[PDB]
Amino acid sequence: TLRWQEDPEPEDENLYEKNPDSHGYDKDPAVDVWNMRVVFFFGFSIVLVLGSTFVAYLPDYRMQEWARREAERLVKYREAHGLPLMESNCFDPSKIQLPED
Amino acid sequence: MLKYIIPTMMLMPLTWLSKNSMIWINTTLHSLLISLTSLLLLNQFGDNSLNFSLTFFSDSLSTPLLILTMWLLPLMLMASQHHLSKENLARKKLFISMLILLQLFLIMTFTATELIFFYIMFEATLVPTLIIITRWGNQTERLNAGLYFLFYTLAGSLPLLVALIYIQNTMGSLNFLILQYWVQPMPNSWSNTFMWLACMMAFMVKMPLYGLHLWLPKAHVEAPIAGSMVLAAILLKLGGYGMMRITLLLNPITDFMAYPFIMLSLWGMIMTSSICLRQTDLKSLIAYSSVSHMALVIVAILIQTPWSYMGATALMIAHGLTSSMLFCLANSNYERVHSRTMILARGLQTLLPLMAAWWLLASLTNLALPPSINLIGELFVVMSTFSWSNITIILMGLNMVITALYSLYMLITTQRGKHTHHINNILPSFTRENALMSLHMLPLLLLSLNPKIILGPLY
Amino acid sequence: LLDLIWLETILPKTISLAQMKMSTTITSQKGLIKLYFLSFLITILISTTLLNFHE
Amino acid sequence: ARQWQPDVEWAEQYGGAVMYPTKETAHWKPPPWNDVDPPKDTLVSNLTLNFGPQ
Amino acid sequence: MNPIILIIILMTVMLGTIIVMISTHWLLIWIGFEMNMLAIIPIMMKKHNPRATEASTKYFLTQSTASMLLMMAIIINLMFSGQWTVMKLFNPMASMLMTMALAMKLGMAPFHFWVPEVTQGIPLSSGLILLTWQKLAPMSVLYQILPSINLDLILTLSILSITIGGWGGLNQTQLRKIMAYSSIAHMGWMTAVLLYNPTMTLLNLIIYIIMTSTMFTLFMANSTTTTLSLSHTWNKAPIMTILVLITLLSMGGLPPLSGFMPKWMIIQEMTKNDSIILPTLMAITALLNLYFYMRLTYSTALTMFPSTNNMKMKWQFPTTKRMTLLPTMTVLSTMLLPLTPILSILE
Amino acid sequence: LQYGPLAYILGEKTTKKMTENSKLITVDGNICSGKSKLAKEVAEKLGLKHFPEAGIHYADSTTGDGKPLPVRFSGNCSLEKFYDDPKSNDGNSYRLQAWLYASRLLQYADALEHLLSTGQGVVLERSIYSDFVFLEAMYRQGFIRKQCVDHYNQVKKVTVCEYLPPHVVIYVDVPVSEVQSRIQKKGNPHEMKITSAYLQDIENVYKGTFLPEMSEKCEVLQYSAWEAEDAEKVVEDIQYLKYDKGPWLDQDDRKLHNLRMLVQDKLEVLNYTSIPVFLPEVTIGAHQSDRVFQEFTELPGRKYRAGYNEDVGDKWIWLK
Amino acid sequence: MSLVYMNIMMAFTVSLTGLLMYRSHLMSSLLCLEGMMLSLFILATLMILNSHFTLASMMPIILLVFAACEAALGLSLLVMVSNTYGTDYVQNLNLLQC
Amino acid sequence: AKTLLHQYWDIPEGTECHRKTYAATSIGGASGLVVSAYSVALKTPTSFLEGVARTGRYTFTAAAIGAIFGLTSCISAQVREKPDDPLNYLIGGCAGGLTLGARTRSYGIGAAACAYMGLTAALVKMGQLEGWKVFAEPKV
Amino acid sequence: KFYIQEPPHGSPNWLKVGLTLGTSAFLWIYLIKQHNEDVLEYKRRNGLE
Numbered sequence A: 001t002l003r004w005q006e007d008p009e010p011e012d013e014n015l016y017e018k019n020p021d022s023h024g025y026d027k028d029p030a031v032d033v034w035n036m037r038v039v040f041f042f043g044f045s046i047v048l049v050l051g052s053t054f055v056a057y058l059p060d061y062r063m064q065e066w067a068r069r070e071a072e073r074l075v076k077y078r079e080a081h082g083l084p085l086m087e088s089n090c091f092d093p094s095k096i097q098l099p100e101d
Numbered sequence B: 001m002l003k004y005i006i007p008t009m010m011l012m013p014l015t016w017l018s019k020n021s022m023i024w025i026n027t028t029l030h031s032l033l034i035s036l037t038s039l040l041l042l043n044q045f046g047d048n049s050l051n052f053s054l055t056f057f058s059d060s061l062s063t064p065l066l067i068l069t070m071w072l073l074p075l076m077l078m079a080s081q082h083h084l085s086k087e088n089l090a091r092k093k094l095f096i097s098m099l100i101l102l103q104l105f106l107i108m109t110f111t112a113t114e115l116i117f118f119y120i121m122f123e124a125t126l127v128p129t130l131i132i133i134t135r136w137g138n139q140t141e142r143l144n145a146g147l148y149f150l151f152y153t154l155a156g157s158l159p160l161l162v163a164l165i166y167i168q169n170t171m172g173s174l175n176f177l178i179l180q181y182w183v184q185p186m187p188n189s190w191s192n193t194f195m196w197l198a199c200m201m202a203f204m205v206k207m208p209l210y211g212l213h214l215w216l217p218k219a220h221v222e223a224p225i226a227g228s229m230v231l232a233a234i235l236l237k238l239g240g241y242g243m244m245r246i247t248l249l250l251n252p253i254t255d256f257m258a259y260p261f262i263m264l265s266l267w268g269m270i271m272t273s274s275i276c277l278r279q280t281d282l283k284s285l286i287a288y289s290s291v292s293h294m295a296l297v298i299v300a301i302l303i304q305t306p307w308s309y310m311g312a313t314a315l316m317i318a319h320g321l322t323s324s325m326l327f328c329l330a331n332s333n334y335e336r337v338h339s340r341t342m343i344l345a346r347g348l349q350t351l352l353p354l355m356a357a358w359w360l361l362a363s364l365t366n367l368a369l370p371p372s373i374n375l376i377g378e379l380f381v382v383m384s385t386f387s388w389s390n391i392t393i394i395l396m397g398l399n400m401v402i403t404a405l406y407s408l409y410m411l412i413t414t415q416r417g418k419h420t421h422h423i424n425n426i427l428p429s430f431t432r433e434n435a436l437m438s439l440h441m442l443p444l445l446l447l448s449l450n451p452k453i454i455l456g457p458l459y
Numbered sequence C: 001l002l003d004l005i006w007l008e009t010i011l012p013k014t015i016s017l018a019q020m021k022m023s024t025t026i027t028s029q030k031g032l033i034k035l036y037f038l039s040f041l042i043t044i045l046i047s048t049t050l051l052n053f054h055e
Numbered sequence D: 001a002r003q004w005q006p007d008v009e010w011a012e013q014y015g016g017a018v019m020y021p022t023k024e025t026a027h028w029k030p031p032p033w034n035d036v037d038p039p040k041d042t043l044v045s046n047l048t049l050n051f052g053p054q
Numbered sequence E: 001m002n003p004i005i006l007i008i009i010l011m012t013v014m015l016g017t018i019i020v021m022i023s024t025h026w027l028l029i030w031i032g033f034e035m036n037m038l039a040i041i042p043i044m045m046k047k048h049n050p051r052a053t054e055a056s057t058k059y060f061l062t063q064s065t066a067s068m069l070l071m072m073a074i075i076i077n078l079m080f081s082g083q084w085t086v087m088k089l090f091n092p093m094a095s096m097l098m099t100m101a102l103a104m105k106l107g108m109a110p111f112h113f114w115v116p117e118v119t120q121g122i123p124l125s126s127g128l129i130l131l132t133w134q135k136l137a138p139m140s141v142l143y144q145i146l147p148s149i150n151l152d153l154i155l156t157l158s159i160l161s162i163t164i165g166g167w168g169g170l171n172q173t174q175l176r177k178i179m180a181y182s183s184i185a186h187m188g189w190m191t192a193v194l195l196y197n198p199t200m201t202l203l204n205l206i207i208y209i210i211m212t213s214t215m216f217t218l219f220m221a222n223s224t225t226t227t228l229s230l231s232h233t234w235n236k237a238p239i240m241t242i243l244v245l246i247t248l249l250s251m252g253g254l255p256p257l258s259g260f261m262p263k264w265m266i267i268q269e270m271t272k273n274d275s276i277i278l279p280t281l282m283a284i285t286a287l288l289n290l291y292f293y294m295r296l297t298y299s300t301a302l303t304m305f306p307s308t309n310n311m312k313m314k315w316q317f318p319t320t321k322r323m324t325l326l327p328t329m330t331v332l333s334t335m336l337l338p339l340t341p342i343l344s345i346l347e
Numbered sequence F: 001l002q003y004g005p006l007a008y009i010l011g012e013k014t015t016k017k018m019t020e021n022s023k024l025i026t027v028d029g030n031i032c033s034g035k036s037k038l039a040k041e042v043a044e045k046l047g048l049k050h051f052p053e054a055g056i057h058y059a060d061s062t063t064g065d066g067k068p069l070p071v072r073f074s075g076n077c078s079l080e081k082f083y084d085d086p087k088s089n090d091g092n093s094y095r096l097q098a099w100l101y102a103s104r105l106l107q108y109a110d111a112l113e114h115l116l117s118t119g120q121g122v123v124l125e126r127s128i129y130s131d132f133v134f135l136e137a138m139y140r141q142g143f144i145r146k147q148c149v150d151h152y153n154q155v156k157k158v159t160v161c162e163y164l165p166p167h168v169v170i171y172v173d174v175p176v177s178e179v180q181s182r183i184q185k186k187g188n189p190h191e192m193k194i195t196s197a198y199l200q201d202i203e204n205v206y207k208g209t210f211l212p213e214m215s216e217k218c219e220v221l222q223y224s225a226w227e228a229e230d231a232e233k234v235v236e237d238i239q240y241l242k243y244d245k246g247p248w249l250d251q252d253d254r255k256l257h258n259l260r261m262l263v264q265d266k267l268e269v270l271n272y273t274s275i276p277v278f279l280p281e282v283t284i285g286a287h288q289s290d291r292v293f294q295e296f297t298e299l300p301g302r303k304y305r306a307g308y309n310e311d312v313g314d315k316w317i318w319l320k
Numbered sequence G: 001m002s003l004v005y006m007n008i009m010m011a012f013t014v015s016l017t018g019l020l021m022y023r024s025h026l027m028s029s030l031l032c033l034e035g036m037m038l039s040l041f042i043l044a045t046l047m048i049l050n051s052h053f054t055l056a057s058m059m060p061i062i063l064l065v066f067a068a069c070e071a072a073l074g075l076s077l078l079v080m081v082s083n084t085y086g087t088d089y090v091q092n093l094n095l096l097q098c
Numbered sequence H: 001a002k003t004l005l006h007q008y009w010d011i012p013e014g015t016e017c018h019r020k021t022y023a024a025t026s027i028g029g030a031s032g033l034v035v036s037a038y039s040v041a042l043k044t045p046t047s048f049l050e051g052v053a054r055t056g057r058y059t060f061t062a063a064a065i066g067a068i069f070g071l072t073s074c075i076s077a078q079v080r081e082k083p084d085d086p087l088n089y090l091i092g093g094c095a096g097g098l099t100l101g102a103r104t105r106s107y108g109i110g111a112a113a114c115a116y117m118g119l120t121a122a123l124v125k126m127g128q129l130e131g132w133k134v135f136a137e138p139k140v
Numbered sequence I: 001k002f003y004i005q006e007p008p009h010g011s012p013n014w015l016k017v018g019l020t021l022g023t024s025a026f027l028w029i030y031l032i033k034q035h036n037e038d039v040l041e042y043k044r045r046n047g048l049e
């Protein structure tokens, strides 16, 4: 009648029972402490603080500042000599050929 | 890109030659070091993309996905070292090797300058994911979840390869740098119609699209925590990246072709949000929210405006981080109460205050509270789709309400009210779990300060 | 209605049941040599006259 | 709470000669384990000759 | 069987296949085919059980009919050409008869009926020898007469074989029937691309031979015949479960494994000649082969099926079988993708 | 391996090393028939190697260091648990019977290998040709079910057909009352729980099914209780037998070579004992089998092969 | 072509459709095999003798030899069948259907 | 069977309904004859009458499907004045699927056959319009 | 002594080890020699000295 000879389902294990100072990494306290130290050092003191410092001081990302500064020059050109600020044609009309129509 | 592939491949001699119980520490440490070195890919120029060699190149679109993947691997190892404490040492090493191999294929997928190489890695990501889901899951239905996840994707991707090979016989090359200058307009014909279908349906399947999304609620709620993270935060962005790469060749036929899929996604977001309003499972709720957000990304890519592309990539990164955090929250609750029912464990704020704070913060970032990048992406997609048509805002706006109708609901049933009386195994929050949620959230909150690094290749 | 029955019915279950039915139909042979060689003869007859494979 | 692994119900589906039975595949017994059948010895019919008186 | 007689018979099989491969005369081709059939009949009769007698009788009848059709086509070609050079034929009827005979010899559908029954009725050694070695000579003869086969006939045979093998592989629990239906599907895959570029056909033949040999040798090592013992293998040696898992994932055409080597490049040869419907249909049909491979992997490795008490004693006895070239063959069948241009040596 | 087809080709024949003294003898009897020492006497008069009766831990003594494994690793059954309560709900009776039959198959394979390799006869006790009789008693007393009988019949049918019967079988006839008296004088408390009906049914299936069907394919030597105490009569009767029946007569070198090929592969011998037929007595679940196998792997001398274990003192591993 | 060629090809087709539809008897199929072999032999030697290809006269007789290389073999594949069952019917050869 | 398809395809669409319907009926009858011949070959009927009844049933079912498909396609092409449009072939394929459902006395088979044969007929018309090749003559 | 029976691989097969080492050394020196002569003859043919 006893179909499927099977080990009984084990109960849940509480990590705080055998070690009340468990961080939740391993049941061995020294390995758990060292894993906690490694995670908190290389997860917050290395890749977050120094990572955010590296991202904050990026050297002119996508030249987003430079395109401003050159524009600051360029307007000061065409406002000085009476030229229009921007032409309606991106390319020069003299160097482009149209099909006959 | 050889400076990132080689340490990732060397992670396997690290995890196989390690000690009896030092595999997790060494793998987490060295993967965090790889994540630290991943920031060198931010050498982006306003006109030129970063080209490394004839095989690997990195634009401003693949770079946030690469950084997210190499950041996600240590979080994955931290998440998946509690339900495997009873596992065999060889099986534990096999699981870690599976995660390392999957991450290697992911970081080799995004940098591929050839569409055939990209497609090869894009299907090579299937095998470790399927193995993880079908081997280290918990329920029976994972076996069924091993089929719907597989034979959907290949059914979209096996025609597409043929279309890609056709380009190899038509344009002479499949290199993305060459195809940006040798592209040709696509005339309206039935042949180009079916070539558009072949080139798109794989990315509609893997995003997923409403109607074709049936594999995602099944492959999210039987999979383990690491599998849920890899499906939610990375593997749904392969479709978006493939769409953004392949939309260049499919012009100008996309203007009248994108209509039925746009309508499908615009109704599927409402349908999936309404489904989220009545789901009895936390994991299924997160899966359907992922379906809704990826339908929004599908609309953004299909209307193909610069604001839409910017909102699409911002939404991709933000949804990846938020869905990963929500899945880790669900995993912690499942590990504490040993069930997936939403209504079972109520009033957890009176027992876990810090986990209640994390739940509130994750639900806050889910409904796109400004100035988070979720609101940035969703807002820009809304602006672009209002430029597309003036009525679609209604189909956006109502959806927003339903989002705020379930996320807070997902808060309340899990956090507020009278606690249940017959549950008395509620342990205090471990340091590992809190470390996991802080590592999930603090980059997401920090990215609001400088979002210009996740605004696509046309910022 | 939609995402638990009908969307689960039109795409995956139709091809699943069709493949099951075709697999049962194909492999239901009785294992007799005479029927197999009769099928060979019918194949040759079809190829010779109806399909014109000898041209 | 443990990981689910198949029992005799999941393992007995593949124990038949066919995966999806039909009306025609009703008497299909599985093949023997060593693929050696009993000899089914019929009557040998030794011929009876009448070495008679003539 | 005496080992001397077994060695002599195997050498005769090899000599017959070599005679078919290297001869420049049609009569020598038919002589080699007859010698191969005559020396391959008693290999299946190794254990002397009735199922071997049925399998041998069915195989002999099919091969005799195929040889008769081949000789009739040879005689008709002699009548219409007056020579014996193994080259393109000069009569469409002779080409049709030769294609039908070689389809019956290859077991391609709708002449596929004898393949699963013969494969099931014979031991694993004779089954591997048949399904790998006996599929070399007819492919060489098809390679030689390339400007003669009708395109419609060979393409119809290929798509029919692929569809019928993919449909038939689903409803089997015996491993040998699964391998036979897989062989039929791969037969259709090789003959689909033959008229365009036979180098891809040779590549597919080499890959299919390697994977079939790997699966059959793993079946020898695990001593399994059905799906249930293959499931039970996880208790004896899990490394065998890992090997059969990666091998069955390779044969499903899943990258980055070497089983994606032929099929992909087969598609690469059908789109250059403006045929896009057929490779798509062929991949969609090969999804069924992938499906029953996935079912086998679910039964074998990815789930822990229940075992019996007596297997405890099998934990005290290691395997002492002559697993010849098994690790090299597994490595070749799994990790051969980044050496893709190696196939240029097959031109 | 050590013996292969190349060795047979090169000149190592089988019938050249087989003399007339190479005879396989199976001494049989009841539970306390006194054969257990008597067979040993036939070991020390004819110069034949003696094999004790295959118990639960025969395979433990055959391989490894020779020490018996714990019962949770080998057998998973207890003879004393069967003797106390033979109708136990966990199916211990048929599990013990199946393990004993498989151990007897291993012992018969070892004896046939020794006989075919050295040419020296082996003396066995209660071989596989006379184990089912015990099973019949377990069916007559209602100790097990009909499905156990069907599974045992299937395993015996697929296993015993590839072997050969012994040359001589010796049966010691001891009545049930004398068997019970010897059991009571043995002093083992678990053996006193054996009913008289069990021993009577064992004697009935010995005299009714085993011996009438066994005397055609070999030669029987039935002995009383008094005659089995004097081994001189037994060895004198064995030494003057006219062997004319049995399948040993029509054996060439090829048949014995094939038998030696099949016998020397132990996993091939024990291939069909664990057939995948799901019965409550023998089927072990996934988690229990996994736990027992992982605990068995970490045992000393069992993690690797028989010569690659550094924890027991095996050297030159890197050059092997 | 000629006329006797048509008759020999018709005989070959007649024996072919005799072979392909079995009548529950193995010897009849073996006789059909021998008949097709004889028809092929006759057609080959007719063509060879008509075209004066003398060096190919080694072909048919050698061909005839290989006839036995299956035909007698067929008889050796029958006696075990006739030892498995009392008759030689082809409906008894259906054990390999599962 | 090469001449039957060429006979059906050279008739202009929406011009003569009767000849197109007859050609489609002949094509359906030929396919049903092949199917019934293979059926009575592999699966032997218990009697001659049962075999000829099955052959007639299969041939009549396939002929009815082909006839209704051709008639519906020609009627749609005449009614819409769109001869080179695959939607008429889609309508004809769905009509044939409804005929198959009527012959099989079931509704789900009719709906599935309508959908799949409408897609197949639309694809066939698409390939005829664009000059797609299924058995491509090798050129490279 | 631990095992109750002598394992077939208790002692290293010295002839097999010597054959393996000799075969590996011969193959390595043959490949090196072949590569050297191949590159030398390639430099001779094209004159790229």
Ligand SMILES: CCCCCCCCCCCCCCCCCC(=O)OC[C@H](COP(=O)([O-])OCC[N+](C)(C)C)OC(=O)CCCCCCCCCCCCCCCCC
Pocket: A047, A048, A049, A051, A052, A053, A055, A056, A057, A058, B063, B064, B065, B067, B068, B071, B317, B443, B446, B447, B449, B450, B453, B454
């Ligand atoms: C990217 C894709 C993958 C995503 C996951 C990534 C995982 C790895 C993460 C690595 C580390 C993080 C990288 C991103 C860093 C983003 C932050 C950053 O550097 O920004 C650059 C920006 C750069 O600013 P900027 O661009 O304007 O300045 C010009 C540039 N520099 C700095 C060179 C002059 O930094 C700041 O804005 C910092 C400003 C000072 C600090 C903040 C002051 C105000 C704080 C709040 C005060 C109170 C407000 C009210 C509160 C009320 C209660 C709530």
Ligand SMILES: CCCCCCCCCCCCCCCCCC(=O)OC[C@H](COP(=O)([O-])OCC[N+](C)(C)C)OC(=O)CCCCCCCCCCCCCCCCC
Pocket: B152, B155, B156, B159, B160, B162, B163, B166, B191, B192, B194, B195, B197, B198, B201, B202, B205, C015, E274, E275, E276, E277, E280, E284, H123, H130, H131, H132, H133
């Ligand atoms: C996940 C479920 C849904 C999956 C949907 C997948 C996409 C759906 C459409 C796929 C069509 C097949 C690939 C087409 C690639 C075309 C590339 C190309 O160059 O096209 C131009 C070529 C043009 O032909 P050509 O290039 O040879 O000719 C030269 C060009 N002209 C025509 C001008 C002379 O198109 C074709 O050759 C035909 C394309 C249509 C093919 C129709 C047959 C396939 C039907 C769909 C089957 C889908 C799978 C179903 C089963 C799924 C699993 C259950």
Ligand SMILES: CCCCCCCCCCCCCCCCCC(=O)OC[C@H](COP(=O)(O)OCCN)OC(=O)CCCCCCCCCCCCCCCCC
Pocket: E125, E126, E128, E129, E132, E133, E202, E205, E206, E209, E210, E213, E217, E220, E321, E322, E323, E324, E325, E329
């Ligand atoms: C373009 C044309 C290309 C042509 C390429 C030709 C390449 C060479 C020929 C390859 C064809 C197959 C040759 C082997 C056929 C099978 C032999 C066989 O079955 O041997 C039986 C033997 C039994 O061993 P054992 O386990 O002791 O016995 C059990 C009791 N019967 O052993 C076994 O069962 C174990 C298996 C032994 C053989 C394995 C290795 C050879 C076959 C796989 C190929 C490996 C790669 C090398 C060739 C690459 C190209 C194919």
Ligand SMILES: Nc1ncnc2c1ncn2[C@@H]1O[C@H](COP(=O)(O)O)[C@@H](O)[C@H]1O
Pocket: F030, F031, F032, F033, F036, F053, F096, F097, F100, F101, F131, F134, F135
């Ligand atoms: N198959 C079996 N089932 C139960 N008990 C057995 C079996 N075989 C041997 N025995 C026991 O072995 C003992 C006989 O060994 P011995 O006393 O040496 O003759 C008795 O206790 C028997 O009950």
